Structure 1
Amino acid sequence: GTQERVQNSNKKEWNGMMGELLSGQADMIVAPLTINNERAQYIEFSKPFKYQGLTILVKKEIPRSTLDSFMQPFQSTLWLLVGLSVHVVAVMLYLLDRFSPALTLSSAMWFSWGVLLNSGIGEGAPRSFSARILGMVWAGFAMIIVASYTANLAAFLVLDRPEERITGINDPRLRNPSDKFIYATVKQSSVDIYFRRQVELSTMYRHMEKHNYESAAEAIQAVRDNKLHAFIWDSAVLEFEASQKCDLVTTGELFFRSGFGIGMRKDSPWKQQVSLSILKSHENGFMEDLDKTWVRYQECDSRSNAPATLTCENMAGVFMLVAGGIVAGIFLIFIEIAYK
């Protein structure tokens, strides 16, 4: 519907569905026609059978692990320092054991190197009183290191929230736009008129129409391939478009409370009869049945930010490490054969 005006005839006329309605050839609108003060002047509507609105839409992807490798939490210098400290404490245990009045150095180093990574081989443990008071604290150090490790990696695995989902209209979209994500709507639409209506919404509409689109399906496709980040349109349309592909979900909250309604011709008894019948239908589960049957096919939401599962992509570092260890052992068996 459009109230197109021009100076050729100095008169404004309705051209479109409402034009055909007022022309006399049509009888009543059964299309999903919105309501407003403008269209209520010429014709009169009935009681609504739905409550639509405008909600933002945004693409939704599985959360992802985020951990590059196992060497992430502490450092490289931290591992180097702890290794050299293992070596230093092993040689110090050996020095304190033989000097006092029996750890052969190899066995003491094996004991040290085993009691940091929680087991391994090598019975044998210092019998020198200096070493006995040394190790205890070394076991304590290893316990502290291990405890600090899992707390730190678990603290990093619970403070990773890369979504920052748009909660509504009180978001930085209203404050100031940026160049990272974009937001606009289709030109020459009712949403564009409502945006050009208000004061702050006028600046929002300017910043949006700076790069606005001109189609609904094209905007959907652009959102599907990350071309455009978010576009505003009628609630029911995008609500149906979300539950049909299960690739993008809706967001924000509906604030514009204009619902659809049967458009009747002015001053007809069918108007009143129609309002009483649509309200009765709204009560007996009829509208709810039609909603659950026609537009709401299946609840494919699975929303509410399911936590990060870890996956065969971050432990790949540890698998490569154990493979390199296998290779090192394949070399070391021959090295030891030659040495013996």
Structure 2
Amino acid sequence: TVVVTTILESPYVMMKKNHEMLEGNERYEGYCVDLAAEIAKHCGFKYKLTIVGDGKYGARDADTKIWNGMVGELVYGKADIAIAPLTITLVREEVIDFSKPFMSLGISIMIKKGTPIESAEDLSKQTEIAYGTLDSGSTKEFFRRSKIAVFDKMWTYMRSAEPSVFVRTTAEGVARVRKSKGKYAYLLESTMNEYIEQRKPCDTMKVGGNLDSKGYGIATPKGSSLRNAVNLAVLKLNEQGLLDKLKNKWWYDKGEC
């Protein structure tokens, strides 16, 4: 039996209605639960979904350099595979292997509905509507590193803005959009932006296209005999249109707006 590490994060993995009367894999539902079943079928293995204990994606501890989260479970021999919204990054690809992306996503703009902003270009040209990101992590780093004129202009504004336009958590950012009288836009991953747009209270929306491109991938420990089959499975599901349909199911078919 393959031990699959994953994470409780809507709509990827969620506790099912009446989970306390269910057992094993049947306790969970969501996009990644459906994806795990498809991968397992195509690769021909039995598996056990296990929620990562610390509830983390995976980063090196600053002090010890030990990996936490799902990446930790893989690199220290506790799980055979991670099927989760785990971003393909350099720091992680150095220590585990990723499949090709099963979901693409990018940095995107969230506004309260009514806010007179339709593009990053619009945001960049004005200051009455403040805008920012998580105070650490890849979204902030994108702007800090960008040589594209519009994003460089945005970074110049954000890094100097007072009061701070940076937030500690997604919840804080989204709350700030909702309660600041149209004076705050939040920059975050498109998947989460799109998900929140389809939940009550139905008062936010994504504007503009994605500002960059990255992907979520399935991760296996170095030397795994599953690496190849998992990669080919992902490309097959993509090309067959199954992953598009699955995204539509969990974002829109199950939507509230």
Please state which band the TM-score falls in when normalised by the shorter chain.
0.5 to 0.7
Residue 289 of structure 1: which of 245, 248, 252 is its match? Answer: 245
Q: How far off its partner does 1:237 sit?
A: 0.6
1:233 corresponds to: 188
Inter-partner Cα distance in structure 1 for 2:255 and 2:95: 41
2:13 corresponds to: none
2:175 corresponds to: 221
Q: Answer whether contact 1:49 1:278 (CA < 8 A) is retained.
A: yes
Change (3 A) 1:196 1:3: farther
Q: Which amino acid aligns with 1:258?
A: K
- Structure 1 unmatched runs, 5+: 62-162, 302-340
1:206 corresponds to: 159
Change (3 A) 1:55 1:269: same
Inter-partner Cα distance in structure 2 for 1:208 and 1:36: 29
Q: How far off its partner does 1:20 sit?
A: 2.4
Q: Deviations over 1:263-288 (max 9, x none)?
A: 11112220110011111112223212
Change (3 A) 1:206 1:54: same
Is 1:25 the counterpart of 2:78? The answer is yes
Residue 3 of structure 1: which of 40, 53, 60 is its match? Answer: 60
Change (3 A) 1:202 1:15: farther
Q: Answer whether contact 1:45 1:261 (CA < 8 A) is retained.
A: yes
Q: Answer whether contact 2:118 2:207 (CA < 8 A) is retained.
A: yes
Q: TM-score, normalised by structure 1?
A: 0.50
Residue 181 of structure 1: which of 129, 146, 149 is its match? Answer: 129
Greater percentage in strand: 2
Q: Which amino acid aligns with 2:117?
A: R
Q: How far off its partner does 1:215 sit?
A: 1.8
**Number of equivalenced pairs:** 192
Residue 209 of structure 2: which of 233, 253, 258 is its match? Answer: 253
Change (3 A) 1:58 1:211: closer
Q: Answer whether contact 2:96 2:220 (CA < 8 A) is retained.
A: yes
Residue 35 of structure 1: which of 88, 94, 99 is its match? Answer: 88
Q: Answer whether contact 2:74 2:96 (CA < 8 A) is retained.
A: no
Is 1:60 the counterpart of 2:8? The answer is no
RMSD over aligned Cα atoms: 2.6
Q: Deviations over 1:20-60 (max 9, x none)?
A: 22111122111101112221111110011111111101111
Q: Which amino acid aligns with 2:88?
A: I
Change (3 A) 1:4 1:298: closer
Q: Answer whether contact 1:192 1:205 (CA < 8 A) is retained.
A: no
- Mapping of 1:126-205 within 5 angstroms? 164-168=116-120, 170-173=121-124, 178=127, 180-198=128-146, 200=152, 203-205=156-158
Inter-partner Cα distance in structure 2 for 1:299 and 1:23: 38
Change (3 A) 1:298 1:17: closer
Q: Answer whether contact 2:106 2:210 (CA < 8 A) is retained.
A: yes
Q: TM-score, normalised by structure 2?
A: 0.65
Inter-partner Cα distance in structure 1 for 2:220 and 2:157: 35
Inter-partner Cα distance in structure 2 for 1:257 and 1:265: 25
Inter-partner Cα distance in structure 1 for 2:89 and 2:230: 19
Is 1:244 the counterpart of 2:199? The answer is yes
Is 1:13 the counterpart of 2:71? The answer is no
1:129 corresponds to: none
- Structure 2 unmatched runs, 5+: 1-57
- Mapping of 1:85-164 within 5 angstroms? 164=116
Q: Deviations over 1:288-335 (max 9, x none)?
A: 22122111137898xxxxxxxxxxxxxxxxxxxxxxxxxxxxxxxxxx
The structure having more radius of gyration, on CA atoms, is 1
